[PDB]
Design a protein around this nucleic acid. Structure first.
Ligand SMILES: [Mg+2]
Ligand SMILES: [Mg+2]
Ligand SMILES: [Mg+2]
Ligand SMILES: [Mg+2]
Ligand SMILES: [Mg+2]
Ligand SMILES: [Mg+2]
Ligand SMILES: [Mg+2]
Ligand SMILES: [Mg+2]
Ligand SMILES: [Mg+2]
Ligand SMILES: [Mg+2]
Ligand SMILES: [Mg+2]
Ligand SMILES: [Mg+2]
Ligand SMILES: [Mg+2]
Ligand SMILES: [Mg+2]
Ligand SMILES: [Mg+2]
Ligand SMILES: [Mg+2]
Ligand SMILES: [Mg+2]
Ligand SMILES: [Mg+2]
Ligand SMILES: [Mg+2]
Ligand SMILES: [Mg+2]
Ligand SMILES: [Mg+2]
Lengths: 82, 155, 205, 129, 80, 14
RNA sequence: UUAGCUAGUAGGUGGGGUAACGGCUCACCUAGGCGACGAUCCCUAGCUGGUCUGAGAGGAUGACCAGCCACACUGGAACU
RNA sequence: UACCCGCAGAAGAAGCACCGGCUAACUCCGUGCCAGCAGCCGCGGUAAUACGGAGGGUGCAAGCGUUAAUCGGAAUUACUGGGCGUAAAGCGCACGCAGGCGGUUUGUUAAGUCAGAUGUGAAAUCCCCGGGCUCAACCUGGGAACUGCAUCUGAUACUGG
């Protein structure tokens, strides 16, 4: 189904995640639909490393897109820091 | 003041009743580094006698050519016996890229930045003759403005 | 990844001062400077058109101690950068971290200045970079760490470069044991007799 | 036969320029006037006149320097066997901007220097080198 | 407004259908010469009014048979 | 030599 | 050093058929269909985003990554 | 785990190929068209820097050479950018369909072409400016690029009807 999940890019021992919309039948780096944002778990957190766009998020959640718990944590803290 | 360079040395022979008598052929170029190239040719029994007679022809047979701050005005075609010469001026700081034959001609004129490629025959004496004659029919923006007659941006 | 042979033997092969030693003892009081190393050093060798591009390449690479695999990668960067190729070639050679320490005078020789970078003595904006091939950004300040100030390799080197002339773009402070890399150097600010166009033509074929 | 009359026009110009002829004549057309008038306005030739209405005969006055060819070489580019078209940014220059390239567009016949302010493309006629 | 092709009829023997050939000019990807390329389509002809060589106007429709995907609009010129 | 010849058959690569 | 190929083949009516249009299938009717802009036959091959080479135009190729199609001992069939 | 503190002492840590020309570096001895060498040119039957060895040097580098394969060099299938009097090549000649191409003047169409705009050309790769991993490789932000295709509005000089 239409879902919001992560795609692990980056080299070995350097995790990095892409915020895309895809189907449940595709893999982690499988056939997505559109790029939404990005996530850096090894970010220094003094600068850039987490940026999304709530306008593209509300366009698909209103259509009925499911959200994973790891991506939903970014949703719960995008309103605390901004 | 003159900048000289030897190009190639080729021992040739002459057949007589007693057998074979050898000699030497030398092709040289000179220049001032400011758009004046004069090439000569030598024929003598000995190699330092051969290159010196080529230098004696090099004082005369020397032409003028309009440089543009050390590079060509425009790309120009060169044609000879088997030397299809295609040159093209480049941007600042590219350096001289050419064969060993064309490098002797381009250094003594002061030329720095040119594209160069020779098609056909690889005889170095045939390459340089199209190179000299390819520069004398190469023209300047001032002398084509003497043809056209306008002191506008094209100058 | 270095060269362990004799230093001035490379200058006996080339015939050019390469600043391979300090400068206390003269260049000619140790070896015949115009003698090639070996059996026929007094015999004058022939120099072809292929040589003058090769002998110019060997002159610069023996100064900085950069091998062929890394020096070709410097040509991969200088070709991609805009402007003059040779001016961008000098930006990579002078912007090396072991050259900045050497031109300030913390190491008496380039072999000594490379070991000071390698064996944990140089701070770059308060951070220790233990590799000698770091490209130094402009407007940075370098310094000596607190444990390496008492070493005699710094005390003996602050007077030999003081006798020689200093570059313009560097700000050497000997009391605080620090320095500043201000701006990018130019062609005329460096050695004028080194012709960078001879090296590019060999990598242009 | 006479299937490319512009190439027949360029043949008569290049011969008389080299053979020291003072003036040449040729059969006229609407397109040959629209090219020779451009060459008159670009300093390559001197004057052109029309003669005859049922047999239109065009004339060209040559141009020399000290008896030297002003138009050194000219190259027909497009041809009835192979048509050449370029866009407003793919217009080729002749001798890196020294010579002009005759390009006919919907705003009349002009040069690539004049097509910069016009911003159009079309058929390349000849490289006036 | 809608997608519309134009061409001429080369065959009309079959009932309720005609064969319309479409020609187009193609720049060659290697040489650039403009070459006539023939596209032969099968067009549904209601009431069979089209003859041979008629310049005709056709539009796009659903597939009606194994080979047909085009239908009729009107004839521009007939039986000249 | 003619471009219209190479429409029928291109240059034969060995 | 492959020039003619094709009878469910090409089109139409009606019935049947699938989730959907349709020779997809059946009886009947018509003799057309395709093809020197390469039909048909034979051999070889997964394709593409790309990689590499090259000043460029081009050239060679499709491993790792991603997209799609096909396949799951060989062949055939249907259920769910 | 990376990282960092502390200890000891240069202590634990350099080889391969080449050296007649191409192509960077020269002498000596042994061998005697034999042995061998070799990518090309071709070296060696009594003085071989080319064989074998030694001395010395050069080019690379924790790698170095060789073999096989692809492109470049090769403008050596030449669109860019080749030729056909004698180097390979103009059918022995002629008619002629299909095909290609076509004088000049005006009107029209806007087909080809050109201008503008929309949609699209997945991401990754490459390119531009950045950021991060001590550096680099590598990862990554945005932009450019993807020279493509479709549609619409235009211009009418040229080509086509
Ligand atoms: Mg691993
Ligand atoms: Mg002479
Ligand atoms: Mg040849
Ligand atoms: Mg039915
Ligand atoms: Mg896998
Ligand atoms: Mg796959
Ligand atoms: Mg040598
Ligand atoms: Mg050996
Ligand atoms: Mg002997
Ligand atoms: Mg290594
Ligand atoms: Mg091979
Ligand atoms: Mg080629
Ligand atoms: Mg040839
Ligand atoms: Mg012959
Ligand atoms: Mg005959
Ligand atoms: Mg009107
Ligand atoms: Mg993409
Ligand atoms: Mg992207
Ligand atoms: Mg990227
Ligand atoms: Mg960095
Ligand atoms: Mg017309």
């Amino acid at each position: 189904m239409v879902t919001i999940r992560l795609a692990r890019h980056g080299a070995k021992k350097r995790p990095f995640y892409q915020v895309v919309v895809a189907d449940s039948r595709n893999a982690r780096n499988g056939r997505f639909i559109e790029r939404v944002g990005f996530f850096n778990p090894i970010a220094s957190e003094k600068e850039e490393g987490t940026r999304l766009d709530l306008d593209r998020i509300a366009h698909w959640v209103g259509q009925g897109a499911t959200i994973s718990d790891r991506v939903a944590a970014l949703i719960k803290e995008v309103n605390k820091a901004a | 003041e003159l900048q000289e360079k030897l190009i190639a040395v080729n021992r040739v022979s002459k057949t007589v009743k007693g057998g074979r008598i050898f000699s030497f052929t030398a092709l040289t170029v000179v220049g001032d580094g400011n758009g004046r190239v004069g090439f000569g040719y030598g024929k003598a029994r000995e190699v330092p006698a051969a290159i010196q007679k080529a230098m004696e022809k090099a004082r005369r047979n020397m032409i003028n050519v309009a440089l543009n701050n050390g590079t060509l005005q425009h790309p120009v075609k060169g044609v000879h016996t088997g030397s299809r010469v295609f040159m093209q001026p480049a941007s600042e700081g590219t350096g001289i890229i050419a064969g060993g034959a064309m490098r002797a001609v381009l250094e003594v004129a002061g030329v720095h930045n040119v594209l160069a490629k020779a098609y056909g025959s690889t005889n170095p004496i045939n390459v340089v003759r199209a190179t000299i004659d390819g520069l004398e029919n190469m023209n300047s923006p001032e002398m084509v403005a003497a043809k056209r007659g306008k002191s506008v941006e094209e100058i | 990844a270095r060269y362990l042979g004799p230093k001035l033997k490379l200058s006996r092969r080339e015939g050019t001062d390469l600043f391979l030693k300090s400068g206390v003892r003269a260049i000619d009081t140790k070896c015949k400077i115009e003698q090639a190393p070996g059996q026929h050093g007094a015999r004058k060798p022939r120099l072809s058109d292929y040589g003058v591009q090769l002998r110019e390449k060997q002159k610069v690479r023996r100064i900085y101690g950069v091998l062929e695999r890394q020096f070709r990668n410097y040509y991969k960067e200088a070709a991609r950068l805009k402007g003059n190729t040779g001016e961008n070639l000098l930006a990579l050679l002078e912007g090396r971290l072991d050259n900045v320490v050497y031109r300030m005078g913390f190491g008496a020789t380039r072999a000594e200045a490379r070991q000071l970078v390698s064996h944990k003595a140089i701070m770059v904006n308060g951070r220790v970079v233990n590799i000698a091939s770091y490209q130094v950004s402009p407007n940075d300040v370098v310094s000596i760490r607190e444990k390496a100030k008492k070493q005699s390799r710094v005390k003996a080197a602050l007077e030999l470069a003081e006798q020689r002339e200093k570059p313009t773009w560097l700000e050497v402070d000997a009391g605080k044991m620090e320095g500043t890399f201000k701006r990018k150097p130019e062609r005329s600010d460096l050695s004028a007799d080194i012709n960078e166009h001879l090296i590019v033509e060999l990598y242009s074929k | 036969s006479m299937q490319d009359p512009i190439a027949d026009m360029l043949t008569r110009i290049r011969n008389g320029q080299a053979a020291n002829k003072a003036a040449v004549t040729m059969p006229s057309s609407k397109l040959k006037v629209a090219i020779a008038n451009v060459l008159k306005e670009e300093g390559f030739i001197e004057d052109f006149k029309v003669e005859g209405d049922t047999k239109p005969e065009l004339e060209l006055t040559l141009k020399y320097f000290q008896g030297k060819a002003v138009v050194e070489s000219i190259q027909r580019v497009s041809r009835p066997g192979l048509r050449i078209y370029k866009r407003k940014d793919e217009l080729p220059k002749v001798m890196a901007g020294l010579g002009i390239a005759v390009v006919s567009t919907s705003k009349g016949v002009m040069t690539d220097r004049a097509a910069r302010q016009a911003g159009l493309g079309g058929e390349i006629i000849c490289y006036v080198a | 407004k809608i997608r519309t092709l134009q061409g001429r009829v080369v065959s009309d023997k079959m009932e309720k259908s005609i064969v319309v050939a479409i020609e187009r000019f193609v720049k060659h990807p290697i040489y650039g010469k403009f070459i006539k390329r023939t596209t032969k389509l099968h067009v549904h002809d209601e009431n069979n009014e089209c003859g041979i060589g008629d310049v005709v106007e056709i539009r796009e429709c659903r597939p009606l048979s194994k080979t047909k995907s085009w239908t009729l609009v009107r004839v521009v010129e007939k039986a000249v | 030599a003619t471009v219209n010849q190479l429409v029928r058959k291109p240059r034969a690569r060995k």
